[PDB]
């Protein structure tokens, strides 16, 4: 349940804080979308 | 412009992101309310 799974937007740009990812996939079939996974593993001492 | 100044609830209990602070104010007027000033001096190396 605590995973974040978001959307790629159009100009294949996703920001994570500060940190930004570019994802471009060729052959994309029509009836799907590309998503990627922001928190595949985690860890920190304190909560902010 | 970059102060963010809240306004304290009846619970008298303001959160700070993990941390509390417990505002009480005696013989406040029936005009007037009681306010907080949550940033008054912040620095920091990276934006998150």
Redesign the interface.
């Given at each position: 349940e605590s995973a974040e799974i978001v959307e790629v937007p159009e100009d294949g740009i996703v920001s994570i804080?500060?940190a930004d990812v570019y994802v471009k996939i060729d052959n994309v079939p029509d009836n799907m979308s590309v998503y990627l996974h922001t928190n595949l593993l985690m860890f920190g001492t304190?909560?902010?």
């Open positions: 804080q500060d304190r909560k902010n």
